[PDB]
Paper text:
The γA1EC1–4 crystal structure contained four molecules in the asymmetric unit: Two of which are arranged in an EC1–4-mediated antiparallel dimer, with all four EC domains involved in the dimer interaction (chains A and B); and two are arranged in an EC2–3-mediated antiparallel dimer, in which EC1 and EC4 are not involved in the dimer interaction (chains C and D). Given these data we conclude that the EC1:EC4 interaction is required for dimerization. The absence of this interaction in some of the γA crystal structures is therefore likely an artifact of crystallization, perhaps due to crystallization condition, although it does imply that the EC1:EC4 interaction is not particularly stable. While γB7 K338 forms a salt bridge with residue E41 in the γB7 homodimer, it would likely clash with γA1 R41 in a putative γA1:γB7 heterophilic complex.
By contrast, in vertebrates the clustered protocadherins (Pcdhs) provide analogous cell-surface diversity, but in this case generated through stochastic alternative promoter choice. Biophysical measurements with domain-deleted proteins showed that Pcdhs also interact in cis, through a membrane-proximal dimer interface involving extracellular cadherin domain 6 (EC6) and potentially EC5. The specificity-determining cell-cell recognition interface of Pcdhs involves domains EC1–4, as shown experimentally through mutagenesis analysis and suggested by mutation correlation analysis.
Residue numbers in the entry:
A (entry chain B): 2 to 413
B (entry chain A): 2 to 414
Write the structure that this text describes.
């Protein structure tokens, strides 16, 4: 049993072993025995020269073609010596070399992972196969640098097995929606042959962000006589989510509908304008809470305060709250014939009321408490001179433009 | 200024105070004064009888109609004494009673809140309005018991303002999709009247649950001769989420496609069957990783092991690795004429190799190293008796049913 060692992929005619030296044969003795190689499929790679006694290579010795993945790879063929008709077992071990690159069964691996994927989730990676064996076979995986993922390689007896990609830092689609990684598989030769696997990690969206107003409280000041449908304000709300999770619509929070009903907020543009007249008397200010809803149950809040300014638009009102229609012929000076109830719905200088009566007639109005005015007479009237009187009392407020209300009293 | 006090909703003619008693005037003296009602806009609700000297009520005194929510509610009107022509204002305070229930401006407040809503979110609630005043006005809010929500009321000097509903424990649509609450507003009378506002909080779905397999590792044993397309297994994964987030689709994890390519997995029904033949050789077992995907990027993993049974289906193979065709006429007994290399691809009793040669001829086969067989000579054959030889060697394996391979070798003298 003769055993040699030759690397694989040798050049044609490369020396393997000299049979002459190990059998003790010269050139002549080899010629006399008539040594020649016994053929079978595999011995076609080996060539025996009967004069030099040197078994050399006859062709390409691709050990991956011969033994695939086994070790060691030894080719056994018989040498026929015609003299004694003697067979001689020659076994030649094929040492492995590195001439192949690890091949992934694809070029781009595309995966879908939600942004709420719990960190630590594992993804088995495609296996890369190095055609060589031994030290020139698959030796290591390397995941391209990225904060969100890490590489986990199980140490196996034959080599690295079952590569896995682990989620480290939690995903955020609003920051990075697509992560490109590169899984490089490398053997252990010199130089090292690396096969690359492109990884396309796509992040799926989840409604995790409610709208956000530009201001927490929206203030505005408006005249009371402001016409209907005047644009009071425009709010602004943003949503960073994708698609239906990021389309906002505004609406009124059901607070006090007696206040909300006096206003109008466009659901799409968010422009608040007035729908009903604005009266300073009932409401000086208008507090309202507004709401912005996206498409998936999230919402945001904001406050809107509509302060009403005052301008003279309400005239005082005079109520004929007292009338003594029958007034004596001999009444003394200082007797009240009528008491009136005066009231202006406005404030400041626009809300004070003065009383006016024609000054020729004897009776006059004096100052009394709380816009009440007492009509007391200052002289005597003749029974013959005046039988019937149709008097016109004038109540004017003092804020320009002044507003006035008249009351007419008939007396006898 | 004389001030009296009468409650609201009094019967007609009810006593307040005797004006004759307070003015120190008798029945006659006031009649001489000519005391009479000064008739203000709302003064007809007051009735003065000019004989008893007691200004009493004339009708229903509904102060909620009078002063609404103001305080205090005092009615001022003048008493005219015709004697000195002197006016005297009488003020009567209207004492409040409880005849109204707090009324909400709607019947059901319905809201949509995502299951991922950050706890602590506040929702201003619709105001309930009690027409009464004082202690008979709105006094308290009460939110019905619920683990996820609580009531927060801002108090005022007069009473409660801006009731707000706060989310405490985070919502789960997979557990509770609809929450019904009852907001009761109550005054402070005796008995207390409560108005109710039904609340309908709907929870919107969010992909917060990954698939879940029924088994972590799927083991199965199938004969090697199994035909193509035979149903091997069925996996099952459930998801409690709603809609597209809760129906699963199965697929192979991209690991080794040389193993996956030999199989077929329906993505929807999840029934695994074979697509290519299964040979016990090359692969004794078949390990595979499977993946369950919902509709929104979540996934689950499971293992499936398809173990191949072993069956005698590969016959041993005989290789004529050596043949010395030229053989002397006078060769002695014991000389090898041919060496054969036989090999069976199975194991155990199905993998042991036996050799058979014609027993009439002198040559016989003896076993040497491992699986090699040597054709040795035992006697002499005459060239005249036999010039050419067509040999039939049959190799049989030892596992039932036995498989045999025949080889024919031609030799001459
Ligand atoms: C030793 O002798 C045997 C016969 O005893 C030889 O085997 C024979 O080989 C021939 C092929 O040349 C077979 O012919 C076959 O005919 C059938 C008819 O249907 C068909 O299958 C094919 O057309 C085929 O040619 C013949 O059947 C076969 N003998 C037997 C019994 O099956 C053998 O070749 C001889 N070996 C040597 C080294 O001389
Ligand atoms: C306000 O909203 C508009 C509408 O998209 C947007 O363009 C703008 O950026 C927002 N305001 C700010 C300060 O970004
Ligand atoms: C004075 O007022 C009374 C009130 O009814 C009316 O009837 C009368 O016609 C008025 N005087 C004149 C001259 O019109
Ligand atoms: C298996 O999946 C089906 C699919 O709807 C389901 O009906 C069944 O409940 C699942 N298995 C069990 C044990 O529930
Ligand atoms: C592995 O390393 C080789 C060099 O040995 C590169 O060519 C390859 O791209 C990978 O980075
Ligand atoms: C990995 O690297 C190879 C070259 O080694 C490229 O061809 C491939 O596209 C991937 O980037
Ligand atoms: C408020 O309280 C009253 C009793 O005071 C109940 O009748 C009502 O249903 C609500 O609970
Ligand atoms: C609360 O209770 C009132 C009765 O007080 C109902 O009318 C309402 O629908 C809610 O159930
Ligand atoms: Ca090679
Ligand atoms: Ca290599
Ligand atoms: Ca190699
Ligand atoms: Ca996010
Ligand atoms: Ca998102
Ligand atoms: Ca959103
Ligand atoms: Ca006004
Ligand atoms: Ca005014
Ligand atoms: Ca005004
Ligand atoms: Ca009442
Ligand atoms: Ca009440
Ligand atoms: Ca009341
Ligand atoms: Ca949930
Ligand atoms: Ca869900
Ligand atoms: Ca899901
Ligand atoms: Ca088989
Ligand atoms: Ca088998
Ligand atoms: Ca077998």
């Amino acid at each position: 049993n003769i055993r040699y060692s030759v690397p694989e992929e040798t050049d044609k005619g490369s020396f393997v072993g000299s049979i002459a030296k190990d059998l003790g044969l010269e050139t002549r003795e080899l010629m006399e025995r008539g040594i020649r190689i016994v053929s079978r499929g595999r011995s076609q790679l080996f060539s025996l020269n009967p004069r030099s006694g040197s078994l050399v290579t006859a062709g390409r010795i691709d050990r991956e073609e011969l033994c695939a993945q086994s070790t060691p790879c030894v080719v056994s063929f018989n040498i026929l010596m015609e003299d004694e008709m003697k067979l001689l077992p020659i076994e030649v071990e094929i040492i492995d070399i590195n001439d192949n690159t690890p091949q992934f069964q694809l070029e781009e691996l595309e995966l879908k992972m939600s942004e709420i994927t719990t960190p630590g989730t594992r993804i088995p990676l495609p296996l890369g196969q190095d055609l060589d064996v031994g030290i020139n076979s698959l030796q290591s995986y390397q995941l391209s640098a990225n904060p969100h993922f890490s590489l986990d390689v199980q140490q196996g007896p034959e080599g690295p097995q079952q590569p896995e990609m682990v989620l480290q830092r939690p995903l955020d689609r609003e920051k990075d929606a697509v992560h490109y990684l590169v899984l490089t598989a490398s053997d252990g030769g010199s130089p090292i042959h690396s096969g690359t696997l492109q990884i396309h990690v796509q992040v799926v969206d989840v409604n995790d962000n409610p709208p956000a107003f530009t201001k927490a409280e929206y203030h505005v000041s408006v005249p009371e006589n402001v016409p209907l449908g005047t644009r009071l304000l425009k709010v602004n709300a943003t949503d960073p989510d994708e698609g239906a999770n990021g389309r906002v619509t505004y609406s009124f929070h059901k607070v006090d509908h007696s206040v909300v009903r006096k206003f109008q907020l466009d659901a799409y543009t968010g422009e608040l304008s007035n729908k009903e007249p604005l009266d300073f008397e009932e409401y000086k200010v208008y507090p309202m809470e507004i709401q912005a809803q996206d498409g998936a149950g999230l919402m945001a809040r904001a406050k809107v305060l509509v302060t009403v300014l005052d301008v003279n638009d309400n005239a005082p009102e005079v109520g004929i709250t007292s009338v003594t229609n029958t007034v004596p012929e001999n009444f003394p000076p200082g007797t009240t014939i009528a008491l009136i109830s005066v009231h202006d719905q406005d404030a400041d200088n626009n809300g004070h009321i003065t009383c006016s009566i024609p000054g020729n007639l004897p009776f006059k109005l004096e100052k009394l408490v709380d816009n009440y005015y007492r009509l007391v007479t200052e002289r005597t009237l003749d029974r013959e001179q005046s039988s019937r009187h149709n008097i016109t009392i004038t109540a004017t407020d003092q804020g320009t433009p002044p507003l006035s209300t008249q009351a007419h009293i008939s007396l006898l």
